[PDB]
Design a binder for this molecule. Structure first.
Ligand SMILES: Cc1ccc(C[C@H](N)CNc2nnc(-c3ccc4[nH]ncc4c3)s2)cc1
Lengths: 19, 334
């Protein structure tokens, strides 16, 4: 499932601005 | 009229931009109660005023770290913008001061916590719930953009929820005053507009793209473009291919297709009619814009004082103040 793919991506926690 | 509203907003903004207050308080007036967040950006703590007993969210920045990370300009600019703007959904700066080692921005505390945690905990927000938040962002951007301010960092992580369940936008370190184009590569991966990623001169329309990303995530529970790392995320973003959960309404999908539009000549919020194309869109047909601004809409969800039950836990670390002043000239205007 798309949701499953999201989890698998591993970026489910708070995201930082790029630097 | 709304136009007339924006009119006065600009005057008050220009007025306050010239005049920024310095050291309106001191650290000894506050009792630290809990670290609400920490990271590269620094850390925000819940503090209690020793005289009134009122609570605030204090952002602490290590001066040597800010220099090291080359965020002097951004740091001074956030303070400056914060004290100069005034809108119901923009957090307020109430006190600011600095000592030998740190810089402090004491702002309104949002008891409800981070929209991010509630979104992850609940899974996804119903369309009406998503619409209630979205409406607030639309009005906030309408306001900011009228002042030629581009936010540039929209995401659940920066949206706090207050005691009435309404949103308080935080973190203006990337916001910039710009009339036309600007070129700095900045923001958060999942929320970057294609033009930003493509290193092109972009405009305030990147905030509208971001709004689309926000609504999608709120409603789906995950962002429209994801991958293991930024590089791969950028590939998907520029390709512009988006797929919507089957539970997404026809109206919501239409709105998103117009928000997550690579073609800047077609992206909503960037056309001749401006924010009106968004406000008048089918998905917002039932939205009472005036009532939202006036905070007369009962929030769909509403997470004593000093309570931090809505924030995550972080190990409490010392607030070290050095004996020698550090980076005095760099932050003289703070
Ligand atoms: C807890 C938290 C919230 C957001 C983040 C992500 C953010 N990009 C980091 N920078 C920030 N700047 N001002 C912030 C701020 C201002 C007034 C407030 N009142 N109540 C809470 C709160 C937070 S936070 C991290 C931790």
């Amino acid at each position: 499932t798309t949701y499953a793919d999201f989890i698998a991506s591993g970026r489910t926690g708070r995201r930082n601005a790029i630097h | 009229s709304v136009k007339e509203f924006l009119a006065k907003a600009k005057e008050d903004f220009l007025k306050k931009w010239e005049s920024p207050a310095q050291n309106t308080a001191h650290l000894d007036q506050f009792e630290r109660i809990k670290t609400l967040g920490t990271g590269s950006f620094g850390r925000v703590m819940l503090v209690k005023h020793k005289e009134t007993g009122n609570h605030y969210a204090m952002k602490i920045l290590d001066k040597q770290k800010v220099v090291k990370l080359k965020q002097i300009e951004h740091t001074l600019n956030e303070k400056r913008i914060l004290q100069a703007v005034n809108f119901p959904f923009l957090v307020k700066l109430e006190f600011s001061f600095k000592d030998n080692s740190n810089l402090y921005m004491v702002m309104e505390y949002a008891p409800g916590g981070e929209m991010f945690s509630h979104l992850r905990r609940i899974g996804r927000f119903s369309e009406p719930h998503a619409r209630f938040y979205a409406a607030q962002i639309v009005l906030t951007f309408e306001y900011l953009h009228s002042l030629d301010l581009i936010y540039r960092d929209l995401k659940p992580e920066n949206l706090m929820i207050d005691q009435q369940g309404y949103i308080k936008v935080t973190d203006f370190g990337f916001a910039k005053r710009v009339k036309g184009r600007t070129w700095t590569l900045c923001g958060t991966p999942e929320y970057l507009a294609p033009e930003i990623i493509l290193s092109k001169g972009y405009n305030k329309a990147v905030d509208w793209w971001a709004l689309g990303v926000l609504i999608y995530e709120m409603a789906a529970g995950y962002p429209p473009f994801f991958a293991d790392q930024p590089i791969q995320i950028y590939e998907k973003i520029v390709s512009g291919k988006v797929r919507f959960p089957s539970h997404f309404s026809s109206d919501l999908k239409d709105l998103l297709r117009n928000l997550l539009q690579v073609d800047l000549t077609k992206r909503f919020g960037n056309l001749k009619n401006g924010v009106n194309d968004i406000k008048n869109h089918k998905w917002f047909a039932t939205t009472d814009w005036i009532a939202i601004y006036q905070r007369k809409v009962e929030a769909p969800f509403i997470p004593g004082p000093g309570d931090t039950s809505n924030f995550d836990d972080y190990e409490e670390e010392e607030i070290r103040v050095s004996i020698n002043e550090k980076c005095g000239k760099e932050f003289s205007e703070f």
